[PDB]
Amino acid sequence: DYNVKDFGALGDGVSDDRVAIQAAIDAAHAAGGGTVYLPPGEYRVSAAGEPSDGCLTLRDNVYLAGAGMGQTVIKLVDGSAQKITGIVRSPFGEETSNFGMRDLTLDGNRANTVDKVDGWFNGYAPGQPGADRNVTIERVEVREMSGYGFDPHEQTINLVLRDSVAHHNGLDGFVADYQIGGTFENNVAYANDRHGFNIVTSTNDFVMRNNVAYGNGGNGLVVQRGSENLAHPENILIDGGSYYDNGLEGVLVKMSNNVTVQNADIHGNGSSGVRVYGAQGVQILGNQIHDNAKTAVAPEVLLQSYDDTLGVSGNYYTTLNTRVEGNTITGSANSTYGVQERNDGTDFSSLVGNTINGVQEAAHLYGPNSTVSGTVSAPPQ
Ligand SMILES: [Ca+2]
Ligand SMILES: [Cl-]
């Protein structure tokens, strides 16, 4: 057990406590590990150096703990004017293990600073073999970052990020970038200017259990390849939770495969509830998908192919083998179809046992091998 007071941290809302807190982290690390405690207070921090130096660098076996979200706050100094990749982060180009944070708030002070600031960052190095592992983040709030809220990054094995909140950030609340065997559980993302949750860059064997995303400018959740010619995300389970009142689709799956969205409540989004865009083997199971298309006419579920022939892969990604089963889909005034396929090569969809109401047509299919069975709809008046 280490206490940042013993290293000269003032926690007074004005003094720069970066050097004191980093000294407590380094002492815990040199001793073989420990928990660095921050008692209640606002702890101001400045940038440590170059963008990859963040503000504070955690190390192997070191955990930060505050007195509770909103009680312990680590906040960027007024007037900061440089890119900061993680107010708390792991070292760049090192495989860092058994570290994390709990019971505190990170505040990026976007109203009184400039340039891109991310709340949490960790990883090894883009394109390089190597992984951080056993990151545990519990009961953390990340707010007011001009960049990302939480950005666990390439590569991390066995992330646990639970019971946390990301809000009022300029990009995405939570990013899962090249995560392997990781979990987001019981998190909330709201009022971010882009996505609530963004799973990207080859993430695989990843669980999103009981997460909530609402009021974000982008998607509630997007699962996507990203901008580079990399292995697509695959083997992703979205289990339960709620994705509502977002600016774009509730849930977007783009150039990713073997993603399951199940038992979720998806409603009030600007465009479709669920969109599948150049994806294979997606399973949309047992969801309530209703009252979407709030911004303009759209189907509750859209299935379409992604034309990357002039992009980084050179490939045309048809959407194939989508299973849409056991959903209750209820359109509202702007909803066109319950499930729409574009006439773009999308094929091998199978609709099974959906309850579909409130739409112009339950299913609007084009694939020569796409099928629909067991749709339930209210009988005509
Ligand atoms: Ca690292
Ligand atoms: Cl269309």
Side-chain angles (χ1 to χ4, degrees), residues 2-381:
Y2 297 82
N3 184 318
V4 298
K5 302 303 295 184
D6 300 334
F7 294 84
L10 295 170
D12 64 8
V14 50
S15 303
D16 185 356
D17 286 328
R18 166 172 50 83
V19 168
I21 299 165
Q22 187 66 58
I25 290 164
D26 292 345
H29 174 255
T35 289
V36 173
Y37 179 65
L38 300 94
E42 183 183 291
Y43 299 77
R44 292 284 177 141
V45 293
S46 60
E50 294 299 308
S52 59
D53 295 319
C55 298
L56 298 171
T57 295
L58 284 169
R59 301 187 188 286
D60 293 330
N61 311 133
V62 184
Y63 294 87
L64 300 185
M69 293 181 281
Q71 292 281 295
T72 295
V73 180
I74 298 172
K75 183 169 181 176
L76 183 60
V77 290
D78 290 348
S80 187
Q82 58 202 269
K83 179 179 164 66
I84 301 175
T85 307
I87 292 179
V88 183
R89 67 170 291 147
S90 81
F92 176 85
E94 305 182 6
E95 302 187 274
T96 316
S97 298
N98 288 316
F99 65 107
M101 49 171 191
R102 64 178 178 80
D103 291 305
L104 58 80
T105 298
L106 308 179
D107 185 316
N109 197 19
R110 61 181 183 168
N112 302 297
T113 63
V114 300
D115 218 323
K116 182 171 176 296
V117 176
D118 311 307
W120 170 270
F121 183 90
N122 80 269
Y124 180 79
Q128 310 292 330
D132 283 357
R133 86 179 59 204
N134 292 1
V135 176
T136 303
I137 292 167
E138 306 165 289
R139 298 182 304 281
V140 172
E141 173 187 22
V142 173
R143 67 190 186 204
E144 298 293 337
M145 309 290 161
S146 61
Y148 297 103
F150 297 92
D151 187 6
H153 214 81
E154 175 176 3
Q155 299 178 14
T156 306
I157 300 175
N158 195 29
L159 174 72
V160 171
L161 205 176
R162 57 161 63 109
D163 302 315
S164 294
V165 185
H167 64 96
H168 294 98
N169 305 294
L171 295 174
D172 311 328
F174 299 79
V175 185
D177 178 281
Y178 210 149
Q179 302 299 296
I180 307 173
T183 305
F184 286 169
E185 183 158 11
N186 299 335
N187 299 306
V188 178
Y190 69 94
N192 302 289
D193 294 331
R194 199 172 65 188
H195 310 305
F197 298 85
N198 176 10
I199 298 180
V200 61
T201 316
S202 311
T203 287
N204 65 98
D205 182 30
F206 192 86
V207 184
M208 274 190 64
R209 184 160 281 124
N210 194 38
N211 297 291
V212 172
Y214 69 85
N216 302 286
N219 296 112
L221 165 63
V222 50
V223 183
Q224 62 188 331
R225 180 197 70 181
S227 60
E228 288 177 50
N229 191 17
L230 302 176
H232 293 187
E234 68 170 13
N235 187 21
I236 307 298
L237 174 62
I238 315 303
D239 185 23
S242 303
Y243 299 89
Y244 62 97
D245 296 351
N246 301 286
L248 303 177
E249 301 86 8
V251 177
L252 172 63
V253 182
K254 180 181 290 174
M255 287 190 285
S256 302
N257 304 317
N258 300 310
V259 176
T260 294
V261 181
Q262 62 182 32
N263 306 325
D265 190 6
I266 304 170
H267 62 91
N269 298 286
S271 184
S272 299
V274 180
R275 176 177 183 191
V276 182
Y277 192 9
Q280 299 195 24
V282 172
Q283 298 211 152
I284 297 162
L285 309 175
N287 304 289
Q288 307 293 310
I289 308 172
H290 55 108
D291 190 33
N292 293 287
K294 296 319 273 180
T295 304
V297 301
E300 288 292 322
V301 178
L302 177 61
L303 310 178
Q304 72 170 133
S305 295
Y306 195 101
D307 182 359
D308 203 40
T309 61
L310 302 178
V312 300
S313 73
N315 296 323
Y316 191 92
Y317 292 114
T318 46
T319 282
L320 292 171
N321 205 18
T322 309
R323 180 100 166 203
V324 180
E325 179 170 351
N327 303 280
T328 299
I329 303 177
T330 309
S332 63
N334 284 347
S335 305
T336 48
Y337 308 114
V339 180
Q340 183 185 358
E341 290 179 321
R342 287 273 170 76
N343 188 19
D344 65 3
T346 293
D347 200 12
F348 282 92
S349 297
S350 295
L351 281 55
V352 178
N354 301 281
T355 295
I356 305 178
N357 288 292
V359 291
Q360 308 182 11
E361 299 164 32
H364 192 84
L365 306 177
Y366 274 97
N369 299 286
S370 293
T371 59
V372 51
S373 295
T375 300
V376 176
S377 305
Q381 293 283 316

